Amino acid sequence: EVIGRIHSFESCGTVDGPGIRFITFFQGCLMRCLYCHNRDTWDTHGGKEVTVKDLMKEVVTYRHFMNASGGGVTASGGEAILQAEFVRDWFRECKKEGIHTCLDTNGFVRHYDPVIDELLEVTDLVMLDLKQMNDEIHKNLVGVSNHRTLRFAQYLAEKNVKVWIRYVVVPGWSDDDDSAHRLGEFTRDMGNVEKIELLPYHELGKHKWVAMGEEYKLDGVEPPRAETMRRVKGILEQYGHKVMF
Ligand SMILES: C[S@@+](CC[C@H](N)C(=O)[O-])C[C@H]1O[C@@H](n2cnc3c(N)ncnc32)[C@H](O)[C@@H]1O
Ligand code: SF4
Ligand SMILES: [K+]
C-alpha cells in the first residue's frame, strides 16, 4: 500500500454552511514562505506514516456531518501534491463513499506524470494559492520562482477544474496595486475560477520558527488594514471575478 506522511489531521466546521471538513495536513513542503504559519510541515521525512485505510477509518467517523449541503475532506499541509499518488488513492476511496474532496495546494508541480490527471479526476475543488504574480517579489517572499505555480494554474483552466484562488495579503510584500492588477489580469479569462479569496496576513505560527532556531523574517509586520483589503479587492473586481475576504 502507498504510505503517506502526515503532520496531523483534524475535523473542523466548514467556514460557512453546515457540516464539517476533515482536513489532513500532509508533511513536506518545498516552498519557504516568509509568513508560513506551519513551519513544522516543511521536512519531507518527518511526520507520521499512515495508509489510506488508516485515514479512511478516521474519516468515516464524521460521515454524517459530510453531505451535499456541506462538508467533505481536504488535503492540505504542507504541500499535499508532493504526495499525489497517496492523495489520489485517498480521494478515490472518498469518492466510493460519496464524499466531497478538496485539494489545498501551492501548485508547485514539477512533474506532469499521469498521477496528476488521475488526482484531479477525483478532486471536486482545488484551492490554489497564488502568492505573488511579480516573480522578483515571489522569489524573495517564497524562495522559489512562481513559474511552476502559474503553469499549473493554466493547466487547471485547460482541464476546467473548479478552482478558488487564495491570495495572502502581506503589507510591504503583496498589498501593492501593481501586483493586484497582475493577479486580476492573469485569472480574468479562467472561467473555472469560482472566486478569489483574500487572506489577510496574520502572525500565527511564529513560535514554530523559533523552535527551529530560525529567525522569523516578518517581525514587525502587522496585519493589513481593512482599507488595504478593500483596495486590493476593488482592483481585482475590475477583472470580473467574485472577490471575497
Ligand atoms: C500551510 S499552507 C497549506 C496549503 C499550501 N501549503 C499553501 O500554502 O498553499 C492554508 C492557507 O493559509 C495561508 N497562510 C500561510 N501562512 C499565513 C499567514 N501567516 N497569514 C495568512 N495566511 C497564511 C497559506 O498561504 C494557505 O493559503
Ligand atoms: S506553501 Fe504553504 S506550507 Fe509551504 S511554506 Fe508556503 S505557506 Fe508554508
Ligand atoms: K492553497
Judge contact between 165 and 187, C-beta under 8 A: yes
Taking Cα atoms as reference points, which of 35, 6, 28, 21 lies closest to residue 170? 35
- Specify the residue for cell string 502587522: 222
Amino acid (1-letter code) at residue 238: Q
DSSP state of 208: H
Nearest ligand 2 atom to alpha carbon 30: 4
Categorise residue 200: left if φ over 0, alpha if ψ from -120 to 50, beta otherwise: beta
Cα distance between residue 75 and residue 50, in whole Å: 14
- The CA radius of gyration of the chain, in Å to the nearest whole number, is 18
Q: Are 164 and 125 in contact (CB under 8 A)?
A: yes
The H or E element that residue 30 is part of is none
Three-class DSSP category at 11: strand
What type of residue sits at position 173? W
Distance (Å, rounded) from C-alpha 194 to C-alpha 232? 18
Question: Any residues with Cβ below 6 Å from ligand 1, and which?
Answer: 29, 35-38, 76-79, 104-106, 129, 166, 168, 199, 201-202, 204
Q: Are 141 and 129 in contact (CB under 8 A)?
A: no
Which residue matches cell numbers 513536506?
A: 28
Q: Which atom of ligand 2 is nearest to the CA of 29?
A: 4
Q: Whose CA is nearest to atom 8 of ligand 1?
A: 106
Query: Is the CB of 174 within 6 Å of ligand 2?
Result: no
Q: What separation in angstroms does the CA of 145 have from each of 106, 117, 142, 151? A: 12, 23, 8, 11
CA dist 208 → 68, 79, 186 (Å) = 36, 17, 33
Helical residues (DSSP H) of the chain, grouped into ranges: 52-60, 84-96, 114-121, 135-142, 147-158, 177-187, 206-211, 226-237
Ligand 3 geometric centre to CA of 43 (Å): 18
Contact at 8 Å (CB) between 51 and 4?
yes
Q: CA 72 to CA 79: how far, in whole Å?
A: 19
Is there a contact between 20 and 14 (Cβ–Cβ < 8 Å)? yes
The residue among 89, 75, 191 whose CA lies nearest residue 125 is 75
| 200-to-17, 38, 100 alpha-carbon distances in Å | 22, 16, 27
> What is the resolution of the experimental data for this entry, in Å?
1.7
| Residue at 20: amino acid letter | I
Q: Would you tell me the crossing angle of helices 114-121 and 84-96 to the nearest 10 degrees?
A: 30
Binding residues for [4Fe-4S] cluster: 29, 33, 36
Quickly count: other Cβ atoms within 10 Å of residue 244's Cβ.
11
Report d(CA 102, CA 81) in Å as an integer. 12
CA angle at 166 for the pair 161 and 167, rounded to the nearest 5°: 140
- The span from the CA of 58 to the CA of 98, in Å, is 16
Residue numbering of the annotated binding site: 29, 33, 35-37, 78, 129-131, 202
d(CA 190, CA 193): 6
| 78 CA closest ligand 1 atom index | 6
Locate 57 and state its grid cell.
477509518
Pocket test for ligand 1, best of 149, 199, 201, 229 (most atoms within 8 A of CB): 199
